[PDB]
Symmetry: C2
Subunit: 306 residues, 2 copies
């Protein structure tokens, strides 16, 4: 026999990452399919197929854990996921439990990330861990004494949907600051500023060209004027926003994930720029890059069923 | 009314860009690559052209960089890492669906073209653009002009077999021999790419980790990952030393996912000399200056 198999999905805007882990917790499968962006029936299909295939291949019924960028309504189970249009408003858990004849756990992407990063032997005994995702959106996962705080309505750590603080607006020219609309339908949420997408939007706003983050960073590495100006502004903006968040949460460790966590300058600049914006007696948290690379989401989702 | 569209089609991701008459990027989209249904593949491309046509109210020129070769006679595609597109007349099919001319070019050639026209490289006698992603791809530029070859196969370094010194590193008759999408086997495409980096890890350690994950473990100093990275760095130096003995490029520009692994830029210059000829001098080895946009830019400016 094969034993218990744990399946994890990390659902994003573009790609669904799948992982299967055996009883030893060793990853034995890794697939990536296109996230069906129009039909929800197609969305369901994509997920169902991967579960079945893997069930066949390993000859088991694996447990199913899913990490999604948004919130499963704590009462109705309906999903609020701006970046996955196909799934917006659907009862994803119910629908899948039907189609796959077993329990399904759904969890926020950033919570899964934080859970997996925090269960590492190096962080497992930390009093608190903040998992921060900087990708298409800005997402937070709050772990206190090794346990996820998911909150009264599964919204804990939705730092991306808090509005720009005053000191950040002042950096961006106050009444002349760009006010970006948000997928949540509010306006000026940090989701659209500190994410990789936001990094891009901020560049475009000041310079009228739609470059990608890697492209801007490359220009910055070459010392190009616009990119140097952008990076300076963005590093200060990131320090201001995170200083606000750390004044509220005061986490012991902060772990960065998502695409923009690849920008190495972040790890050198944050420790330098944070002190000015924190309280005089604050001490910096340990700020580190994800220890599980891009797999924390999948791992965290799969181990919900541990 | 002049708008230039460029596509960079990869194993995982389709990148799209629109550039105005001033060559300023004014659009940027990124879809997953539909790699099973060719009808879906065609759809993805067609959608992005149309959307952009609507939004800007123009019909843009269309340039596409694909990871593989359009048969110089039949136009049928050989795309080793996209089962979907394999065998189809992509250019013909799209010219139909989009009622205008389409230029197709190899992804690595587009990348190299864009990287070579940078003011910093403009007068270099030769430039090798190297993509390390789902596959291994090369673009050869001599005196600022692309060499695409007798049948569009120039720079297909990914479909050359492991050299003897690389096989020796990996245990000779015990070395993993990976099958290739081209249907040969032992092609470097499956060893030096990000995918190959992963497959090599899995082969020695029996766990399906992603490259970023392996690198993270390496950064933490984990035993297996440190062993893997040492092996992989040596393997990369051996294979590239072989290729540079043939090509002797002035500049090598790295692109694709695995070009983000910073250790490469520190390790290659240290490890290459032992495997090159005694009087070899290292080329200038640099990370892509246009980040992940080289391919899109190159493709769009074919129609320039
Ligand atoms: N290596 C990189 N360096 C800098 N920015 C990057 C890098 N990779 C991706 N990005 C940017 O990160 C953004 C996409 O982040 P990504 O984390 O891939 O999003 P996602 O997959 O949609 N969601 P999720 O995985 O849950 O965070 C885009 O703005 C990219 O340009
Ligand atoms: N930041 C990174 N560090 C290391 N490996 C990476 C990184 N980003 C992506 N990869 C790896 O790169 C491979 C995918 O190549 P990538 O270039 O991202 O996509 P692609 O469109 O399939 N290929 P390409 O032909 O280069 O455009 C996978 O093995 C990824 O794990
Ligand atoms: C309401 C909503 O869509 N929020 C999501 C959040 O759940 C996620 O963690 C973050 C990063 O992916 O992106 C968005 O902010
Ligand atoms: C025959 C074939 O499909 N070769 C492709 C090559 O064209 C491409 O440049 C490289 C990098 O994407 O991947 C593959 O090796
Ligand atoms: K959360
Ligand atoms: K080529
Ligand atoms: Zn919001
Ligand atoms: Zn890991
Ligand atoms: Zn081959
Ligand atoms: Zn550029």
């Amino acid at each position: 026999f094969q034993g218990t198999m744990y399946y994890g999905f990390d659902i994003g805007g573009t790609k669904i990452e799948f992982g299967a882990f055996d009883a030893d917790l060793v990853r034995v499968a890794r697939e990536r399919v296109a996230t069906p962006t129009e039909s929800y029936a197609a969305f369901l299909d994509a997920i169902v197929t991967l579960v079945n295939n893997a069930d066949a291949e390993f000859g088991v019924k694996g447990t199913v854990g899913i990490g999604i960028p948004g919130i499963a309504d704590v009462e109705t189970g309906k999903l609020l996921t701006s970046n996955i249009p196909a799934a917006m408003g659907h009862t994803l858990q119910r629908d899948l439990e039907e189609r796959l004849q077993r329990p399904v756990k759904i969890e926020n992407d950033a919570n899964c990330f934080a859970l997996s990063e925090a269960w590492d032997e190096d962080l497992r005994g930390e009093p608190s861990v903040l998992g921060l995702i900087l990708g298409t959106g800005v997402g937070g996962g709050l772990i206190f004494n090794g346990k996820v705080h998911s909150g009264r309505a599964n919204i804990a750590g939705e730092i991306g949907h808090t509005r720009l603080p005053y000191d950040a607006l002042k950096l961006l020219g106050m009444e002349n600051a760009p006010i970006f609309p948000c997928g949540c339908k509010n306006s000026g949420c940090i989701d659209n500023y500190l994410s990789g997408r936001g990094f891009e939007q901020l560049y475009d706003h000041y310079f009228s060209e739609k470059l990608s983050a890697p492209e801007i960073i490359a220009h910055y590495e070459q010392g190009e004027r616009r990119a140097v100006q952008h990076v300076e502004r963005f590093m200060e903006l990131l320090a201001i926003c995170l200083a606000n968040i750390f004044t509220c949460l005061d986490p012991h460790v902060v772990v960065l994930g998502g695409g923009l966590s690849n920008f190495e300058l972040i790890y050198q600049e944050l420790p330098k720029r944070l002190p000015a914006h924190l309280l005089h007696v604050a001490k910096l948290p340990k700020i580190i890059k994800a220890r599980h690379g891009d797999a924390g989401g999948v791992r965290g989702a799969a181990f919900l069923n541990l």
